[PDB]
Design a protein around this ligand. Structure first.
Ligand SMILES: [Cs+]
Lengths: 311, 13
């Protein structure tokens, strides 16, 4: 029952949670925490290339609303947690609380209270904690919330699309109007995996006009840092994306967020440089990208540490 | 200091 602190990095399938500490040196420590005493639906999965005979399974009913529930409430927030059990194969199980003390909002209870997760069948008698999950579950069944609603719940299953029929047409049809999206993954600083709304397109988006240090089978200078810079700001965040262009299945675009433009930020931090092959498709003024990059180069920041000024 | 976590939180709310 040791309360430890942390910061929500992302929400996983079955409502599992990855928690991190803050940068004290290099990469911040990560912790996958499964929620004890409850069972949430499984998200859609795409078969790994490692297992070629396996195939893509879809969403379980109310699995995606369950993920979205926690994503809206937990992402970027400070939480406290206690580990209840740790299986010999390394998997940790525990309780997650919103706040700084263990009497804050219990995440597991919040899920069950809204019919987004059910109680695990216990053979023994309920502890104090398992009893309230029962109350939350009955209140949810009475109110007919989520999985306790009338019907399949099949409308909560996304028609996930991992490819696009014609990328050029799909991008041009939006006429550079911002698209509601969720940043699901961060490959490196300037390339992300986005879930496009409202038809649930899972696409690869590269930032227009710039390029961050990348990995190739291995990391380049400031690659892991730049990835974290983008991750710590946009991972599983609600954003708007301007579909500016495309090369094959990869979509060139710009990510919009109330806290700022990640493209300008990356440049100003020296985590990225301007590239001329794609700078023409940047619709938010390419001259500002030049200024952001020039700002960093003058101060020899990160990738410009070994920059030699002309003389 | 090249591991820059944001001061202000970038939340969905
Ligand atoms: Cs039902």
């Amino acid at each position: 029952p040791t309360v430890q602190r942390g910061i929500i990095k992302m929400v996983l399938s079955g409502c599992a949670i990855i928690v991190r500490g803050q940068p004290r040196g290099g990469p911040p420590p990560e912790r996958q925490i499964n929620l004890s005493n409850i069972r949430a639906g499984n998200l859609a999965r795409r078969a790994a290339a490692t297992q070629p005979d396996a195939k893509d399974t879809p969403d379980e009913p109310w699995a995606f609303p369950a993920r979205e529930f926690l994503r809206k409430k937990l992402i970027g927030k400070e939480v406290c947690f206690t580990i209840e059990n740790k299986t010999p194969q390394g998997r940790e199980y525990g309780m997650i609380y919103l706040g700084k003390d263990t009497n804050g909002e219990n995440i597991a209870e919040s899920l069950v209270a809204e019919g987004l997760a059910t109680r695990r069948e216990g053979m023994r008698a309920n502890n104090p904690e398992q009893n309230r999950l029962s109350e939350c579950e009955e209140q949810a069944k009475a109110a007919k919330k989520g999985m306790w609603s009338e019907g399949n719940g099949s409308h909560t299953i996304r028609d996930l699309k991992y490819t696009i029929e014609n990328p050029r047409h799909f991008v041009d049809s939006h006429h550079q109007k911002p698209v509601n999206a969720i940043i699901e993954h961060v490959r490196d600083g300037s390339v992300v995996r986005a879930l496009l709304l409202p038809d649930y397109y899972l696409v690869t988006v590269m930032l227009s006009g710039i390029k961050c240090p990348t990995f190739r089978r291995t990391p380049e200078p400031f690659a892991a840092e730049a990835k974290f810079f983008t991750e710590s700001r946009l991972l599983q965040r609600d954003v708007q994306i301007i579909l500016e262009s495309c090369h094959n299945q990869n979509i060139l675009g710009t990510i919009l967020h109330p806290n700022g433009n990640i493209t300008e930020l990356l440049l100003k931090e020296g985590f990225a440089r301007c590239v001329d092959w794609s700078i023409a498709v940047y619709t938010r003024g390419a001259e500002k990208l030049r200024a952001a990059e020039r700002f960093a180069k003058e101060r020899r920041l990160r990738i410009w540490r070994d920059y030699v000024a002309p003389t | 200091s090249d591991w820059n976590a944001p001061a202000e939180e970038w939340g969905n709310w």
